[PDB]
Paper text:
Werner syndrome helicase ([name]) is one of the five human members of the RecQ family of DNA helicases that unwind DNA in a 3′–5′ direction and play important roles in multiple pathways of DNA repair and maintenance of genome integrity. [name] is a 1,432-amino acid, 162-kD polypeptide that contains a central helicase core of two domains (D1 and D2) that share homology to Escherichia coli RecA (residues 528–730 and 731–868, respectively), together with three additional helicase associated domains in the C terminus: a zinc-binding subdomain (869–994), a winged helix (WH) domain and a helicase and RNase D C-terminal (HRDC) domain. Our analyses of DNA damage markers and cell viability demonstrate that ATP-binding and ATP hydrolysis by [name] helicase, but not [name] exonuclease activity, are essential for maintaining cell viability and genomic integrity in MSI-H cells.
We report the first crystal structure of the full catalytic core of [name] helicase in complex with an ADP nucleotide at 2.2-Å resolution, providing a solid basis for structure-based drug design. Somewhat unexpectedly, the catalytically essential K577 does not form direct hydrogen bonds to the β-phosphate, instead forming polar contacts to motif II (Walker B motif). One unique feature of [name] is an additional β-hairpin inserted between the first helix and second strand of the D2 domain. In the [name] helicase core structure, the WH domain is positioned in an opposite orientation and displaced by around 30 Å from the typical WH positioning in RecQ DNA complexes.
Author numbering: 528 to 949, 954 to 1072
């Protein structure tokens, strides 16, 4: 067990990064790299705090940290974010002046961003910085690009194996997307890491509700369910990102949203630094409500309170999908992630990959598109399927407290609205709330029959038309009369209802108990649960 940080370390974190404490895995990596000078392979979920692991140590000791990445636009964005935290950083490339390079040699910058190509060609420069200043760490983001079995291989990374040779005292921190053992093996062997610490944060984002819908045929019909008509104009429910597979589909979606006068912006690769800066400005400040994006990184979609992610079209793969939905709910508030898809979507098109020569690669793409289509068509828990892919193992639904609840995914939410089996211990809270309310709404003056007719939307004359205006009228048609009758007998046995006759023995009423009235009081103001021992009559297999 590693030690807690000292006060000087915490003070540095507050002054430069505005955080009052390290996250657990952040400190795992930081202490290992900063104080133990040990190589690291770190797998961090979306929105955990990956960048702090390599930005903080060079700031704390006032030396240089080298960040190797192929995403030039992302390195530009992070440089700006660092300077706005009073941290000097720069992107080093062939196009840079010697004044920037001489300021680097004098130690004016804490964090230096380079591409893999520039790094392979200038190993002598790296050794000079190590002798004169000292390199705290070398970060290799997108480290899965080092070998084939990742979702995106690059050849420029293979020459990073000389870093350990030219700099055997400098620890390397490699960041990758999944906890895949095979990918981690390749990173260690190709980067020449020496017994590195292996850390994984887990991948669950419990505040992200997951849903998958089929496309309806036209864009406006697909998107209008996500809109609210305030006054006499349309609005998104909250800040929204719409991911499109192509620029063409981006323009089509934009053209349709403009029909409703929705405030929208686009986000693509190859945009200028000024364009990305302006999009970030408008999105963060809620001057645009929706960003329609074809990329999943950068300033433009770096926003804390994104409430809704929409994939318009099947996602490319599970890794892209996870990163793309990972942009939502970074403030901890409840967010929703919807995929709108059809079998003809371009990312599910097996027509356009017959012409790839590699044997294992073509089979990988076929299995990925089959895995994607299986997830989209699945009736089981969306969250369990996603967590299984990134843990490289079958995940149990009992591992996290979010699975199986109404805020988990659409397939879990369907089971709470109309239960089914796969001892039966199930949450009948939603159904009990309908029944116990109907008993109290009708005044506890009739038998259980009238509340049942109320819930099933009966046209009977026993029910006064004043009750047909109610919200619950007809919301129980999912269950038969005998089901509601049998469910009421379980509420009598458990002790939430009782049958009672007063002086008039020709009138039997069904009334709430003390426990019944107490439960309904809490359920009026909070979503309450009610666990039961059931029969296959209640939740059939
Ligand atoms: N130690 C910390 N305490 C609290 N919040 C943090 C900490 N480290 C990072 N964060 C926040 O987490 C958010 C996501 O971090 P970031 O590195 O941008 O995620 P990603 O690695 O997915 O891009 C950031 O807005 C950042 O402010
Ligand atoms: Zn230690
Ligand atoms: Zn679920």
């Amino acid at each position: 067990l590693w030690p807690a940080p000292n006060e000087e370390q915490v003070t540095c974190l507050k002054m430069y990064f505005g955080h009052s404490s390290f996250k657990p895995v952040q400190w795992k990596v930081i202490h290992s790299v900063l104080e133990e000078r040990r190589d690291n392979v770190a797998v961090m979920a979306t929105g955990y705090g990956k960048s702090l692991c390599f930005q903080y140590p060079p700031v704390y000791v006032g030396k240089i940290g080298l960040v190797i990445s192929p995403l030039i636009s992302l390195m530009e964005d992070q440089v700006l974010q660092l300077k706005m935290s009073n941290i000097p950083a720069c992107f080093l490339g062939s196009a840079q002046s010697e004044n920037v390079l001489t300021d680097i040699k004098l130690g004016k910058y804490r964090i230096v961003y380079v591409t893999p190509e520039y790094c392979s060609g200038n190993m002598g420069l790296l050794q000079q910085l190590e002798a004169d200043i000292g390199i705290t760490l070398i970060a290799v983001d997108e480290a899965h690009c080092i070998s084939e079995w990742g979702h995106d291989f690059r050849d420029s990374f293979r020459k990073l194996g000389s870093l350990k040779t030219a700099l055997p005292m400098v620890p390397i921190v490699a960041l990758t997307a999944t906890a895949s053992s095979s990918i981690r093996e390749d990173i260690v062997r190709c980067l020449n890491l020496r017994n590195p610490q292996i850390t994984c944060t887990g991948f669950d984002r419990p505040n992200l509700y997951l849903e998958v819908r089929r496309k309806t045929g036209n864009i406006l019909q697909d998107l209008q369910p996500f809109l609210v008509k305030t006054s006499s104009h349309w609005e998104f429910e909250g800040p929204t990102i719409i991911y499109c597979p192509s620029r063409k589909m981006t323009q089509q979606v934009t053209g349709e949203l403009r029909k409703l006068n929705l405030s929208c912006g686009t986000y693509h690769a190859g945009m200028s630094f000024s364009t990305r800066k302006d999009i970030h400005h408008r999105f963060v400040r809620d001057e645009i409500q929706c960003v329609i994006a074809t990329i999943a990184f950068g300033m433009g979609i770096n926003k804390a309170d994104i409430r809704q992610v929409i994939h318009y079209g099947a996602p490319k793969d599970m890794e892209s999908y996870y990163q793309e939905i990972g942009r939502a709910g970074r403030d901890g508030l409840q967010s929703s992630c919807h995929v709108l898809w059809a079998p003809a979507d371009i990312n599910l098109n097996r027509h356009l990959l017959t012409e790839i020569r590699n044997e294992k690669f073509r089979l990988y793409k076929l299995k990925m598109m089959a895995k994607m289509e299986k997830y989209l068509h699945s009736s089981r828990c969306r969250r369990q399927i996603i967590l299984s892919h990134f843990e490289d193992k079958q995940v149990q639904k009992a591992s996290l407290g979010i699975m199986g609840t109404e805020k988990c995914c659409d397939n879990c939410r369907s089971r709470l609205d109309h239960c089914y089996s796969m001892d039966t211990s199930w949450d009948f809270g939603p159904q009990a709330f309908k029944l116990l309310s109907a008993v109290d709404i009708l005044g506890e003056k009739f038998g259980i029959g009238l509340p049942i007719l109320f819930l099933r939307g009966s046209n009977s004359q026993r029910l006064a038309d004043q009750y047909r205006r109610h919200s619950l009228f007809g919301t129980g048609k999912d269950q038969t009369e005998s089901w509601w009758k049998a469910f009421s007998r379980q509420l009598i046995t458990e002790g939430f209802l009782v049958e009672v006759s007063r002086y008039n023995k020709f009138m039997k009423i069904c009334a709430l108990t003390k426990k019944g009235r107490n439960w309904l009081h809490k359920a009026n103001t909070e979503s309450q649960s009610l666990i039961l021992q059931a029969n296959e009559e209640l939740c059939p297999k």
